[PDB]
């Protein structure tokens, strides 16, 4: 296990933190708590070429909460630029994020991601998205909510960093599992009587 610094950039509310959390814990955070500066999160995938670890530098998209700004990109070995397909202004600012990113990270694999494709009223159409071609970025339509192509940016980055385009995610074999009380039935009560979110979802 070698580790690669990934920087995650993009406009406010595009779904960067939601995306990372989804990969870390499996959760879908519905609240928008704006990142202050950066949150570093280790994130491991298991491949047929061994474990690959990313140090995911989850940067802040809002200007006022920006922090060190381009200082977060130093020694980054890859990156994800994120925008929201339900707002044009986040796609319009993709060149600004890229510009600041490639000034520091001159030669690194970058993914461009169009988040929130699960929303019906799509504003940035598929044919509009072409900025990645000249700048040699990989592009994926994604949704942190529906998990649409959620694994692709990491699969692709892993292939480039390890340098094997036949690299695949694999399942690690699971060890056989093993064979407070006054608050555990209190949790079990409030859990049964708290409703599971999104009960209209197909799962």
């Amino acid at each position: 296990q070698v580790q690669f610094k990934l920087v995650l950039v993009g406009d406010g509310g595009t779904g960067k933190t939601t995306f990372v959390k989804r990969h870390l814990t499996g959760e879908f955070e519905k609240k928008y708590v704006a990142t202050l500066g950066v949150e570093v999160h280790p994130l491991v995938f298991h491949t047929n070429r061994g474990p690959i670890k990313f140090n995911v530098w989850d940067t802040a998209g809002q200007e006022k909460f920006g922090g060190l700004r381009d200082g977060y990109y130093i020694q980054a070995q890859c990156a994800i630029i994120m925008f929201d397909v339900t707002s044009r202004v986040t796609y319009k600012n993709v060149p600004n994020w890229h510009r600041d990113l490639v000034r520091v990270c001159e030669n690194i694999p970058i993914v461009l991601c169009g988040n929130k494709v699960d929303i019906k009223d799509r504003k940035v159409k598929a044919k509009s998205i072409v900025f990645h071609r000249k700048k040699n970025l990989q592009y994926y339509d994604i949704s942190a909510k529906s998990n649409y192509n959620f694994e692709k940016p990491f699969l692709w980055l892993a292939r480039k960093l390890i340098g094997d385009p036949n690299l695949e995610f694999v399942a690690m074999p699971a060890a056989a599992p093993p064979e407070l009380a006054a608050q555990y039935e209190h949790d079990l009560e409030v859990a049964q009587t708290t409703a599971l979110p999104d009960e209209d979802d197909d799962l």
Binding site: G71, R103, K127, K134, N136, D141
Partner: protein, 1015 residues
């Protein structure tokens, strides 16, 4: 670690260098605290005074990078504010430390990040000071370039970044006047920059200096005159020499691409020839130095050595960019024919690469080409052989169309798709367009290819799921391009062959693939089906067999195929065909229960929707109504039995099986109504009064359950089921009214029982029990018949306005549907029945104005737009009232509320996406006083002198507002901005420009007030 925050003591650099090392090279909790210390250190306003100390004494390159970040912020914002000895002093240690790092070969090699930042930080100074306070910069930069090679190379980085900041990223970040000032300054001194740039290119050949010089060249190509490129040898150097070394190749190919994209003075034969020549050279170097035209570029990209993928990406971008613009230069001359076809043969090979985004880049080109070949006389014969290959490339890489609902999973079985693949829909459309054009350009070649592929699928020598799928999807995609007689035999052969595969191939899996392809093909060829009834009948009966299939993909696709066929072939179902005792719609309706027995409820509703499409084709009103009645036999009998039981109770609805029966009856009514529209009225009339009674009964039980079990009840299955019944009843009415032709019967029969059922119920329920679909249903009622029921619009407002506004004014997050549907309803009311807002008592009309400015402040795009649109339309509404008491009292109460609130969202950074509409709204408000369309004074009688014009008071108000809102602006900056802003209120593109200038000046101190005299 926290000692660096305290500036009462001197800054400890060795401490700083470790908190930085802890941040980048460390982890965990130590990393998190170190980042907070660094952000507070950065954000301290006196931190820049420590930057020269850091640049001299610091040992850590990242500490120095952050020191330059603090300066970057100082220079872009508070530069003007500084004493002139600080400005001239900061310039000295930046210029002095850039040259320091370039003399040290090891620092120049190993610390490129710190050098690029120092260069960027210099360019920020140049934006401020150059050329007015630094006239000698460019001649001294050229003078320094002769001495050292590291200095020369780094100057190319400074000139690159300066070109970026002035021409590429100035539109947002600078005032119009200052962007123009800087562009003209560079444009004025580019003569001697290019002279250096070009002599360096002739004297290096391949190295880091040559790359950096070519990097800056790429930026110059974005803006410089055409004479610099075409009246110098430089096209020869790019197209020959710099193509041969791989270090220069990537950046050269990008330069040439930018050059290639230019439009040519087509009068000139010399530039035309030069444009042919650099292409001719570039292609020659690719053939000799990289790979020949025959090379398997698919395998190369897939192996992914070095920059091979980036190179092939850039080649594709270069070839397509050039050939889209300039391929006509190669098309007449017979000696240039081989060059034209080689370049296209490279694209044919690039197009075989498995990489979707690259494929889209190439496909976009092929579309451009085949489109031109379709319309341009005498072009298609040139590309016969290129097109012939492209048909094969596209047929073999057809993506799964939307309609095909079966896929292969990671296990390796043919399974229903879990979700829709949203990203391949545009890719399919793009492929179909190109493949359609190619089929038109040679219909014989396309048939032969597809049939010979289909022959090898039968004999088994090329059988797989990928091959048969792609073939069938392509066969389907080209529906329309053959003649009727050719399609006749073509489709017969395809079907008869696909049926052969059905027989031979065994298993659950194989049978599902072939059926999904047969379904796709059949559904794509309605013209065939219409001319061949016996076949159409057989198809439809086979689809009905598939509705009983244990495989769900096949089942679900048969329903979608059925609906798809009937949308196009409906007429052949309503007539009585030869050899048939009756119309086929009769037969379908008769066995409807038997046919749909194994279908899920939503699939049954599609089936009913399909029957609806057919029935609406019957133009005899007696017979259409009868068919409608026969179709609705099962749901009407279920419905009549439910009302007899609900008459006896109405507590029997608590039984959740009854709730589901009810919901599906309404859903079936909704489904038939969507296809039938205005023709559905007789079925609606049959159930309408009992339905709105059931709405009340269902609404009782919801409220009763909320009181009995708490707000949590709204999450339970039984209540959500009861809520569904209400949503679907509202959907049915919304759907009918939205398509109804006879608006008199809507107003007389439907509207008044509806309002009585839903409005008082909505109003009297708790927030969490209120269905937002009430609001949506009313939006449609007002939209279609709002003008006809002005007294009914008032009743809608009174019931939904204040209780809904109270749900959505605590924060921006809660009740998101209600939020959205609320402002839609207010929007359509304000357009269609504005009178309703005049009858609101004064205090409620205040809440309405508060409701609109609340919409402005939303980040939510749907709310924000409707907020700004209501504001716009409200001003027009009040304007058209003329000089009357309500308009006068409006302007006295709410004019400056709208002006100030519109100004808040322009200026606060967090409502950027509404800039256009905000600007338009603000222009319309300001226009009123400069046309004198506000008849009364806008001020208190003794606030200003007597008889002062509204134009004077408006400037005086805004001056004061902005002065308090932005105390760092000077009086002159404000006075200049408003002078400009007011007299541009009949010129929106300039008005918007003057706003963006303002937005730039408020992010800094000491902005130039003359900037606002730009137009």
């Amino acid at each position: 670690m926290e000692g660096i925050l305290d500036f009462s003591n001197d800054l400890d650099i060795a401490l700083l260098d470790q908190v930085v090392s802890t941040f980048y090279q460390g982890s965990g909790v130590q990393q998190k605290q170190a980042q907070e210390i660094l952000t507070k250190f950065q954000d301290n306003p006196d931190a820049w005074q420590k930057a020269d100390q850091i640049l001299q004494f610091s040992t850590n390159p990242q500490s120095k990078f952050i020191a330059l970040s603090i300066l970057d912020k100082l220079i872009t914002r508070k530069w003007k504010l500084l004493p002139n000895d600080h400005r001239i002093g900061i310039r000295n240690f930046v210029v002095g430390m850039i040259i320091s790092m370039c003399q040290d070969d090891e620092v120049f090699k190993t610390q490129k990040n710190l050098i690029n930042k120092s260069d960027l930080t210099l360019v920020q100074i140049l934006k401020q000071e150059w050329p007015q306070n630094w006239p000698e910069f460019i001649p001294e930069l050229i003078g320094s370039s002769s001495s050292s090679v590291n200095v020369c190379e780094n100057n190319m980085i400074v000139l690159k970044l300066l070109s970026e900041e002035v021409f590429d990223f100035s539109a947002e970040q600078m005032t119009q006047a200052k962007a123009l000032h800087l562009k003209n300054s560079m444009s004025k001194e580019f003569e001697q920059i290019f002279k250096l740039c070009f002599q360096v290119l002739e004297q290096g050949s391949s190295s880091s200096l040559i790359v950096a010089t070519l990097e800056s060249l790429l930026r110059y190509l974005h803006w410089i005159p055409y004479r610099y490129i075409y009246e110098t040898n430089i096209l020869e150097l790019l197209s020959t020499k710099f193509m041969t070394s791989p270090d220069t190749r990537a950046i050269t190919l990008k330069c040439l691409t930018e050059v290639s994209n230019l439009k040519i003075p087509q009068d000139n034969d010399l530039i035309k020839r030069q444009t042919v020549l650099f292409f001719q050279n570039t292609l020659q170097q690719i053939a000799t130095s990289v790979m020949p035209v025959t090379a398997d570029l698919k395998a190369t990209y897939a192996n992914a050595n070095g920059n091979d993928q980036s190179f092939l990406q850039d080649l594709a971008m270069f070839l397509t960019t050039y050939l889209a613009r300039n391929r006509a230069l190669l098309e007449s001359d017979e000696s240039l024919r081989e060059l034209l076809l080689n370049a296209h043969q490279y694209l044919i090979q690039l197009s075989k690469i498995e990489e979707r985004e690259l494929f889209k880049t190439t496909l976009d080109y092929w579309h451009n080409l085949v489109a031109d070949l379709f319309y341009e006389p005498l072009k298609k014969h040139i590309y016969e052989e290129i097109c012939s290959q492209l048909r094969l490339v596209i047929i073999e890489n057809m993506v799964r169309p939307e309609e095909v609902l079966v896929v292969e999973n990671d296990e390796g079985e043919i399974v229903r798709e879990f979700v829709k693949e949203s990203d391949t829909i545009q890719l399919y459309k793009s492929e179909r367009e190109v493949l359609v054009y190619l089929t038109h350009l040679n219909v014989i070649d396309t048939e032969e290819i597809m049939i010979s592929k289909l022959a090898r699928q039968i004999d088994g020598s090329e059988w797989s799921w990928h091959n048969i799928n792609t073939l069938s999807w392509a066969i389907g995609s080209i529906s329309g391009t053959m003649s009727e007689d050719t399609e006749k035999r073509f489709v017969v052969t395809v079907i008869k062959d696909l049926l052969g595969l059905c027989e031979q191939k065994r298993g659950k899996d194989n049978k599902a693939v072939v059926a999904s392809d047969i379904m796709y093909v059949v559904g794509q060829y309605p013209r065939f089906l219409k001319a061949h009834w016996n076949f159409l009948r057989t198809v439809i009966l086979k689809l009905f067999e598939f509705m009983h299939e244990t495989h769900e993909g096949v089942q679900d696709m048969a329903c979608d195929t059925f609906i798809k066929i009937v949308q196009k072939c409906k007429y052949h179902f309503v007539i009585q065909q030869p050899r048939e005792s009756e119309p086929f719609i009769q037969t379908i309706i008769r066995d409807i229960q038997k046919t749909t027995a194994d279908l899920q409820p939503q699939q049954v509703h599609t089936f009913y929707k399909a029957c609806g499409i057919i029935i609406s084709e019957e133009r005899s009103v007696a017979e259409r109504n009868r068919l409608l009645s026969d179709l609705m036999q099962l749901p009407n009998m279920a419905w009549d039995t439910i009302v007899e039981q609900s008459t006896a109770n109405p507590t029997l609805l608590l039984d959740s099986e009854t709730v589901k029966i009810i919901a599906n009856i309404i859903k079936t009514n909704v489904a038939v109504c969507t296809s039938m529209g205005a023709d559905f009225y007789p079925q609606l009339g049959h159930i309408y009064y009992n339905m709105l009674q059931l709405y009340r009964a269902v609404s009782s039980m919801i409220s009763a359950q909320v009181a009995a079990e708490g707000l949590i009840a709204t999450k339970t299955p039984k209540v959500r089921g009861l809520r569904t019944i209400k949503k679907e009843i509202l959907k049915l009415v919304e759907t009918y009214i939205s398509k109804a032709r006879n608006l008199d019967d809507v107003v007389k029969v439907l509207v008044e029982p509806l309002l009585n059922a839903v409005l008082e119920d909505y109003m009297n329920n708790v927030p969490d029990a209120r269905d937002a679909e009430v609001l949506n249903c009313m939006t449609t009622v007002v939209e279609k018949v709002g003008h006809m029921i002005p007294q009914g619009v008032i009743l809608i407002l009174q019931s939904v306005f204040e209780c809904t506004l109270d749900m959505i004014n605590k924060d921006f997050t809660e009740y998101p549907e209600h939020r959205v549907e609320f402002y839609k309803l207010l929007k359509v009311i304000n357009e269609k029945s504005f009178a309703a807002f005049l009858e609101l008592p004064p205090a409620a009309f205040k809440l309405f104005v508060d409701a609109i400015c609340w919409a402005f402040k939303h980040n939510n795009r749907d709310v924000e737009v409707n907020g700004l649109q209501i504001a716009l339309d409200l001003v027009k509404n009040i304007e058209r009232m003329g000089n009357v008491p309500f308009a006068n009292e409006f302007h006295k109460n709410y004019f400056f509320i709208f002006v100030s609130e519109t100004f808040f969202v322009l200026t606060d950074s967090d409502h950027k996406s509404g800039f256009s509409k905000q600007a338009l709204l603000l222009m319309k408000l300001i226009s009123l006083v400069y046309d004198n369309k506000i008849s009364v004074p806008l001020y208190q009688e003794a606030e200003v002198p007597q008889g002062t014009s509204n134009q004077v008071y408006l400037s005086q108000y805004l001056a004061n507002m902005l002065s308090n809102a932005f105390p760092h602006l000077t009086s002159e900056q404000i006075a200049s901005f408003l002078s400009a802003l007011t007299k541009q209120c009949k010129d929106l593109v300039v008005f918007k420009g003057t706003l963006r200038d303002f937005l730039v000046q408020i992010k800094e101190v000491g902005g130039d007030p003359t900037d606002y005299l730009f137009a």
